[PDB]
RNA sequence: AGCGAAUGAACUUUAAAUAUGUAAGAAGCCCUUGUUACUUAACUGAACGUGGGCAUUCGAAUGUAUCGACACUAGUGGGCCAUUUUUGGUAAGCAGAACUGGCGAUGCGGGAUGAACCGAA
């Protein structure tokens, strides 16, 4: 949340299924991965989130 | 804030409908992440990536004449003692008088 | 049927902005400055200030 | 013009890769608010040097207040005013408690006495005569003179303008 | 609620962060130039004749 | 110079040759060549009449025409984002392709050291 | 601005303001390969076919009370004044172009009054 702003999104029904689509949309708007009609490119931001995780921009362990 | 709360109106299918509820923001600007009326305040003030869509959704503000009037010589420059032109932070005194 | 000013009635204000209750409750419009003794203006700034 | 203030305006040419760290000019400007103080800064600067608003920037604007607005000072203003013939120099003197009160009385004087407008008057230098016997005008020297004391003959009473009629005739000795 | 709680925070920090930098540069021996304004409200106050 | 039927040209109208010169309204304009002759050329030039526009077919000599390089920007720009789009897709890093219209200046500081400001009078005397 | 850069409006590293022509993708680009009735020493050019990428930033901003093609149907085809630019002339008036604006089909507030002024439909 602190790395990529991440304002409080709606978890909707269940958990995780819709939160990932919400967290990608906010990342697309903040980083700049919008569309032609202003829509958030979910594939671009999730790739950009995947680009950050492989590069080490996100921290975690097991 | 007082321009949107008091004289804020939208463009829903070409019609001027006032922002009386948060719901009509989401049905027209919720595809850009703007779902509340504080979101529209934040997008207009701190100019964000969806300013193109927020400003055109906003109907032009039909303001009143200023309370107390203009300066005596209205159609001169603000630097020359009048009202026309750029006044920077002094637009707020004009907003408070008109709105 | 009737346009309602959020600045006049606070029920429509609480309808639009739920944070308006905690804004008044915690007095966010009366936040004070952070503590700390303010250091004096530099003397170099003063002689610049009244040069001519 | 109204409640005039005195501003310190710092400006410079826009920095360039060929000319980094430019000359950083400064002027003292008597203006009613900030937006004309910035406008009068770029008006004079484009007259002297090549720098203009599009190719320059404003570094700082700071108001300057009087050291002691409660003491009475004699001020000498050198000014250059444009008439229908040409440019002329004057040295005028006024007795105030502040520098903005000096130029406020100056603009009223030049408008009343020489029909001069704001865009024709160039305030060259405003100085405070720190010691007396440097006052050189006869009207101000008249006020500086020793144990000064005058009466107030023919003081009209302040009768309210909506009191149309009065019973007793007014007196002019107070 | 949480988003407007977050929004009103930055309105306070941005005012304080612009204030503190003008204070610091003054003390360090420099001048701070604020960013030119990115938002302008335009009011038409004269009729379209000639 | 070689001029093809159907290219963009600029009309300058040099004063050295009095033959085949057009009016001063077609001096310093830009049009399209539609007919080429032995010594003159035919240029279609848009002209403004009140509210509408009219296309006028006038004859200009070779000595007064000159090719325009308005195609030079469009051909350069079309290639330029194409190689970057090939590069950005190869790298898998998103890249801005449009051109942004000159944002306002940001905030910074200016040190007064070695740059003490000089006070100027309203008029220069020295 | 400089000529502590060169050279000398006709000087230029740079560069105004200000109006004013032309372009700003998918109906688009490039080149490869073939033909032609055109052209050239020659796919050197033009045309017809071939290939590619990007359709979830398709290549500046702002606005968009839809746009285009075809067919059919009425009324119109006068000018007067002013600003700016500009050509000529007089002792001074003045005459002619180009743009824009107003009035012409327009009510209201003001300038005591008013075709040409100011505000505002």
PDB file of C-alpha atoms in Angstrom, chain D residues 86-168:
ATOM      1  CA  UNK D  86       9.137  65.994 -22.005  1.00  0.00           C
ATOM      2  CA  UNK D  87      10.746  64.513 -18.921  1.00  0.00           C
ATOM      3  CA  UNK D  88      11.560  66.726 -15.942  1.00  0.00           C
ATOM      4  CA  UNK D  89      13.138  66.171 -12.530  1.00  0.00           C
ATOM      5  CA  UNK D  90      11.651  67.334  -9.244  1.00  0.00           C
ATOM      6  CA  UNK D  91      12.736  67.119  -5.628  1.00  0.00           C
ATOM      7  CA  UNK D  92       9.627  67.260  -3.441  1.00  0.00           C
ATOM      8  CA  UNK D  93       9.452  66.974   0.337  1.00  0.00           C
ATOM      9  CA  UNK D  94       6.668  65.651   2.563  1.00  0.00           C
ATOM     10  CA  UNK D  95       6.190  65.016   6.300  1.00  0.00           C
ATOM     11  CA  UNK D  96       4.732  61.593   7.163  1.00  0.00           C
ATOM     12  CA  UNK D  97       5.403  58.543   9.327  1.00  0.00           C
ATOM     13  CA  UNK D  98       5.990  55.968   6.573  1.00  0.00           C
ATOM     14  CA  UNK D  99       7.409  55.511   3.091  1.00  0.00           C
ATOM     15  CA  UNK D 100       4.093  54.417   1.585  1.00  0.00           C
ATOM     16  CA  UNK D 101       2.574  57.561   3.085  1.00  0.00           C
ATOM     17  CA  UNK D 102       5.352  59.451   1.298  1.00  0.00           C
ATOM     18  CA  UNK D 103       4.376  58.219  -2.156  1.00  0.00           C
ATOM     19  CA  UNK D 104       0.645  58.346  -1.367  1.00  0.00           C
ATOM     20  CA  UNK D 105       1.000  62.075  -0.736  1.00  0.00           C
ATOM     21  CA  UNK D 106       3.254  62.298  -3.796  1.00  0.00           C
ATOM     22  CA  UNK D 107       0.696  60.910  -6.247  1.00  0.00           C
ATOM     23  CA  UNK D 108      -2.030  63.136  -4.819  1.00  0.00           C
ATOM     24  CA  UNK D 109       0.320  66.122  -5.062  1.00  0.00           C
ATOM     25  CA  UNK D 110       1.471  65.461  -8.628  1.00  0.00           C
ATOM     26  CA  UNK D 111      -2.085  64.813  -9.796  1.00  0.00           C
ATOM     27  CA  UNK D 112      -3.433  67.949  -8.133  1.00  0.00           C
ATOM     28  CA  UNK D 113      -0.578  70.322  -8.940  1.00  0.00           C
ATOM     29  CA  UNK D 114       0.725  69.116 -12.309  1.00  0.00           C
ATOM     30  CA  UNK D 115      -2.117  66.839 -13.560  1.00  0.00           C
ATOM     31  CA  UNK D 116       0.230  63.848 -13.614  1.00  0.00           C
ATOM     32  CA  UNK D 117      -1.039  60.275 -13.824  1.00  0.00           C
ATOM     33  CA  UNK D 118       0.447  57.075 -12.441  1.00  0.00           C
ATOM     34  CA  UNK D 119       1.998  55.921 -15.716  1.00  0.00           C
ATOM     35  CA  UNK D 120       3.915  59.207 -16.102  1.00  0.00           C
ATOM     36  CA  UNK D 121       5.558  59.403 -12.656  1.00  0.00           C
ATOM     37  CA  UNK D 122       8.860  57.583 -12.129  1.00  0.00           C
ATOM     38  CA  UNK D 123       9.766  57.306  -8.445  1.00  0.00           C
ATOM     39  CA  UNK D 124      13.534  57.659  -8.645  1.00  0.00           C
ATOM     40  CA  UNK D 125      14.637  57.720  -4.999  1.00  0.00           C
ATOM     41  CA  UNK D 126      12.827  58.102  -1.679  1.00  0.00           C
ATOM     42  CA  UNK D 127      15.107  59.076   1.191  1.00  0.00           C
ATOM     43  CA  UNK D 128      14.507  59.845   4.849  1.00  0.00           C
ATOM     44  CA  UNK D 129      16.306  62.981   5.996  1.00  0.00           C
ATOM     45  CA  UNK D 130      17.925  61.325   9.007  1.00  0.00           C
ATOM     46  CA  UNK D 131      19.048  64.639  10.481  1.00  0.00           C
ATOM     47  CA  UNK D 132      17.281  67.964  10.227  1.00  0.00           C
ATOM     48  CA  UNK D 133      18.941  71.037   8.683  1.00  0.00           C
ATOM     49  CA  UNK D 134      18.898  68.911   5.512  1.00  0.00           C
ATOM     50  CA  UNK D 135      15.301  69.988   4.901  1.00  0.00           C
ATOM     51  CA  UNK D 136      15.376  72.484   2.036  1.00  0.00           C
ATOM     52  CA  UNK D 137      11.723  73.283   1.317  1.00  0.00           C
ATOM     53  CA  UNK D 138      10.079  76.290   2.997  1.00  0.00           C
ATOM     54  CA  UNK D 139       6.756  74.616   3.802  1.00  0.00           C
ATOM     55  CA  UNK D 140       8.298  71.658   5.623  1.00  0.00           C
ATOM     56  CA  UNK D 141      10.932  73.806   7.389  1.00  0.00           C
ATOM     57  CA  UNK D 142       8.008  75.878   8.635  1.00  0.00           C
ATOM     58  CA  UNK D 143       6.640  72.818  10.437  1.00  0.00           C
ATOM     59  CA  UNK D 144      10.046  71.748  11.804  1.00  0.00           C
ATOM     60  CA  UNK D 145      10.627  75.109  13.549  1.00  0.00           C
ATOM     61  CA  UNK D 146      11.084  75.450  17.292  1.00  0.00           C
ATOM     62  CA  UNK D 147       8.244  75.297  19.897  1.00  0.00           C
ATOM     63  CA  UNK D 148       5.648  75.231  17.126  1.00  0.00           C
ATOM     64  CA  UNK D 149       2.096  76.028  18.219  1.00  0.00           C
ATOM     65  CA  UNK D 150      -0.823  77.311  16.149  1.00  0.00           C
ATOM     66  CA  UNK D 151      -4.515  78.000  16.762  1.00  0.00           C
ATOM     67  CA  UNK D 152      -7.379  76.691  14.601  1.00  0.00           C
ATOM     68  CA  UNK D 153      -9.491  79.647  13.433  1.00  0.00           C
ATOM     69  CA  UNK D 154     -12.904  79.144  11.798  1.00  0.00           C
ATOM     70  CA  UNK D 155     -13.426  75.478  12.616  1.00  0.00           C
ATOM     71  CA  UNK D 156     -16.830  74.578  11.205  1.00  0.00           C
ATOM     72  CA  UNK D 157     -18.882  72.308  13.491  1.00  0.00           C
ATOM     73  CA  UNK D 158     -19.638  68.764  12.381  1.00  0.00           C
ATOM     74  CA  UNK D 159     -23.424  68.944  12.030  1.00  0.00           C
ATOM     75  CA  UNK D 160     -25.092  65.780  10.744  1.00  0.00           C
ATOM     76  CA  UNK D 161     -26.170  66.025   7.121  1.00  0.00           C
ATOM     77  CA  UNK D 162     -29.601  64.546   7.847  1.00  0.00           C
ATOM     78  CA  UNK D 163     -30.298  67.178  10.525  1.00  0.00           C
ATOM     79  CA  UNK D 164     -31.782  69.567   7.977  1.00  0.00           C
ATOM     80  CA  UNK D 165     -32.938  72.309  10.360  1.00  0.00           C
ATOM     81  CA  UNK D 166     -31.368  73.603  13.559  1.00  0.00           C
ATOM     82  CA  UNK D 167     -32.719  76.071  16.092  1.00  0.00           C
ATOM     83  CA  UNK D 168     -29.562  77.849  17.280  1.00  0.00           C
TER      84      UNK D 168
END
